[PDB]
Amino acid sequence: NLAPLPPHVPEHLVFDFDMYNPSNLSAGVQEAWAVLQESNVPDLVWTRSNGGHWIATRGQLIREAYEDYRHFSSESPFIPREAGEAYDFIPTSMDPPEQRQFRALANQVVGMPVVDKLENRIQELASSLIESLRPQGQCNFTEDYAEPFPIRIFMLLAGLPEEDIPHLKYLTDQMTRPDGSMTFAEAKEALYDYLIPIIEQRRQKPGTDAISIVANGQVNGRPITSDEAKRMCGLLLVGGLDTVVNFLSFSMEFLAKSPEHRQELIERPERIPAASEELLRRFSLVADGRILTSDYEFHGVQLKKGDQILLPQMLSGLDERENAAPMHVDFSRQCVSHTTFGHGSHLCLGQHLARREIIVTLKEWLTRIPDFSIAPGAQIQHKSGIVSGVQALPLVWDPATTKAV
């Protein structure tokens, strides 16, 4: 399933890689991508698959490209481009200076000050999920914890009723993990229709929740429209589900396979924040890209207007040019560099909320269930895409080894 080769592309840079089905995926999705980083692979390849696109395979180029939006535009940041159809969340596809307007507003609903005063409320949530899960000695972490936790946090900061959760879950599910029983465009529209009367109602009778703030904010020097507010509110929901769900699963998979790293955090919980950062580098998982605004020589390669380039957020921290022994998880690693939250003006708005969800999940899980492991006879499968993930995480443990608090 390959596309014809563009007259401006030399064949010696051509490289067979499909980001939805990489070859050695059974070893681990991060491993599978790292094939782009073997010794005889140029810093910049072309692939004929998924429509046809460039790939930056190295942290230096990825960061450079993410730093130059004049050449590398967010107008089409998904590969293949058809995956952009009906994707109109805000501010994903905007560039400065308009993009900035929506980041100022967003910072008011998920900036560090908001994260901080939500923390204790987040840990009681985390605890409650864990506490009422412990004497089972088993779980599908992915369904049992990774999914309910972030969506429950959204409800908390959006000020939405708990029984609204089944509905939103379904809708975001159809978006992320389609069923054939609903198109993404339909699921998206349903989410907007859920949001839009709440927005209008709270524009005229405000609270302190995320929706009120966004609905009552200004962008470009005039009031945010209902349309703008739902498209951004929509992304504050969707932006922090599939990525938190999957990152927590990669991480939790690692700890279930590695008693030595558990005991370290168990003997030294003070290390957990630093370990989270290391877990973020090693199990990075986003890969999107940019589109070319113009013809452009780039690191000795000629790109043309319309060309899409993939700029894997995942690969920078795995680039051994950037971290020695990259597949190694060392919680005392001294110079951790990565682009797990992205890079440039679009670097993740939820980064502070997402770090705090990780650190609390770790501080609260190990506090109660120190020893656990992967289910016996368990084929744990990774999937590869824009947000790579874990299919399921059956965990097993002995109830007498835990400690309720």
Binding site: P97, N107, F341, H343
Partner: protein
């Protein structure tokens, strides 16, 4: 080493900042909210604006042309000692450096 953060209202915070850490990173990690650091430290947003005290402007590496470009769109008063503090990487020689944090970043 140690870095002192002076808010617009005169309030004064001194922080112990590890070598290799940017003045932005240290601010965000310790509840210095008047430093936002939106882009996370690549001179892409201008929300980590600070005024570096004249006693340390000889001692900080000059800004690169990228930082200069971004500084044009700071929202607070742009001054000669204006810096993106995500571009200030901390070192022992910079111990006790003074930065004044402006009344706005957004």
């Amino acid at each position: 080493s140690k870095v002192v953060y002076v808010s617009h209202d005169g309030t004064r915070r001194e922080l112990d900042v590890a070598c290799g850490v940017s003045l932005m990173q240290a601010a965000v990690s310790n509840g210095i909210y008047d430093i936002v650091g939106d882009c996370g430290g690549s001179a892409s947003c201008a929300t980590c604006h600070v005024y570096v005290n004249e006693a340390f402007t000889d001692k900080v590496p000059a800004a690169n042309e990228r930082e200069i470009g971004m500084l044009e769109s700071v929202t607070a008063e742009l001054k000669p000692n204006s810096r993106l503090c995500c571009q200030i990487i901390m070192t022992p020689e910079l111990d006790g450096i003074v930065v004044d944090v402006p009344d706005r970043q957004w």
